[PDB]
């Protein structure tokens, strides 16, 4: 007889194990420090 045929080829192998998750972000910056207020007006002379 001729050479007998081969066996059925395998199914496609499995995937890799997939990557991990991203590390978190750092704590956000602070808000711009506010500014002090305006000095009051010049007062008048006290009572005599």
């Amino acid at each position: 007889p001729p050479p007998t045929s081969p066996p059925p080829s395998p199914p496609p192998s499995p995937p890799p194990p997939r990557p991990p998750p991203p590390p978190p972000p750092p704590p956000s910056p602070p808000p711009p420090n506010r500014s002090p207020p305006p000095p009051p007006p010049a007062s008048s002379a006290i009572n005599p």
């Binding site: 002379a45 006290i46 009572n47 005599p48």
Partner: protein, 49 residues
């Protein structure tokens, strides 16, 4: 006509001291001056604040 004087009103017996916040550097005067910026007077009767 009658050579008699009638209306006399007396002056002051003691001198008033300048209040706090006021000064007086003149000798014979009738008021106080509120003294200028950058200076202060924290006692009554100051010659110069």
């Amino acid at each position: 006509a009658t050579l008699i004087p009638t209306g006399l009103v007396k002056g002051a017996q003691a001198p008033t001291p300048c209040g706090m916040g006021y000064f007086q550097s003149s000798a014979e005067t009738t008021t106080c001056t509120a003294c200028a910026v950058g200076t202060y007077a924290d006692q009554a009767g100051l010659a110069a604040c």
